[PDB]
Symmetry: D2
Subunit: 115 residues, 4 copies
């Protein structure tokens, strides 16, 4: 699988478990069509979203439901969700790991792209 | 000035100057309506986007054109744009400062909210 | 004001107020000599630490007492302090703004350096 | 092994390979004594620094040589090193993963503590 998402909780110092997210692919009319989705595991990771053959070049959006995560912990957050929008680019063999580090009023997102 | 956006460049250690961004507000039909737009100044800040009267309760999206910023510096970055989606003014008027810290393969977005 | 430090709280979305910090400068014998100290204001900023004449070339360390900040809010954080170590003024005088973004189990430190 | 360190490069979107670091433990006289050291692997990770029996409660410092990493890439950095200072605390079974996300003028450090 060429795309994995990892989510971490900066308040508790833990993987962020049971975080829902949807992946969309941008269509020719500039709309977002659903592509894949799931929830993070006990390790904070979501594997198996797609396959090499399906994950073609294009613009993708990962929408991570961070608000529901914080609400379950009883903490008021700022963001409605965390958004990661990127172009997949074929330059040799590539695997994408997207990490989201979550705080109630801040998040960071990083891509590690490896061969 | 109930909404201000500040953008910083983590490669150069500088304000990110001339960064374009568009603000949208979610309409009753769930579409994103244009709300305001502008570019960061030499200080990396964009002031004057809206007014207290115009900045009603709602869900807002700030799309910061980080890709064009990096490309003009000779860097091909990961993200298409940095996106910040948030509910504003749900408990009455607040002042929002959104800061985006940019690197080619990572960014963070933080909000300081004051009454 | 060639050195300013700003501290933000990513849990509350606010300036981090009354945060103590100590600045040290490396002496010729490799020990850390006291240089300046202070606490952040209601804006989360600490101004006036030094002057252009006093802030000579050297290696400086800013130790920000993040642990006491979190403990007073009822949180037991991971880090003892946030540490920022840097060479200053190696190519002539510069102005340094150091920002620390704090969460209980994570922090970031960023510098904006201007001529 | 109860302590692992992972280092990521936010400019290239990659693990930060061959990054040297030293771990110190604070002594009773407030000096830092060497405890362990190594360099990150091709995955950006440094494993095997210590053992359960050796890693007792106390204050530890991880000093990551980020300046040498950026210098090898020909990029001028801000920090002399990245410093992570924390107290190890016995509260049930615990494994510490310290992640450092590096940019030339900014870094973030996060602890994920798991059972
Ligand atoms: O007000 C400033 O001059 C200033 C300078 C720096 Cl380095 C800053 O870095 C940051 C890094 C992460 C999140 C927010 C900020 C800031 O809000 C910020 C503001
Ligand atoms: O592989 C891990 O266990 C692990 C642990 C931590 Cl704390 C991590 O923090 C991070 C903080 C910012 C950006 C990426 C990561 C990680 O990719 C990451 C991975
Ligand atoms: Ca291509
Ligand atoms: Ca309301
Ligand atoms: Ca010099
Ligand atoms: Ca104990």
């Amino acid at each position: 699988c060429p795309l994995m998402v990892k989510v971490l909780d900066a308040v508790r110092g833990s993987p962020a478990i049971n975080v829902a997210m949807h992946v969309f692919r941008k269509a020719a009319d500039d709309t977002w069509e659903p592509f894949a989705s799931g929830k993070t595991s006990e390790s904070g990771e979501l594997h198996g979203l797609t396959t090499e053959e399906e994950f073609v070049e294009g613009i993708y959006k990962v929408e991570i439901d961070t608000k529901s995560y914080w609400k379950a912990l009883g903490i008021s957050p700022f963001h409605e969700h965390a958004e990661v929008v990127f172009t997949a680019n074929d330059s040799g063999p590539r695997r994408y790991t997207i990490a989201a580090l979550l705080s109630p009023y801040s998040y960071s997102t990083t891509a590690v792209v490896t061969n």
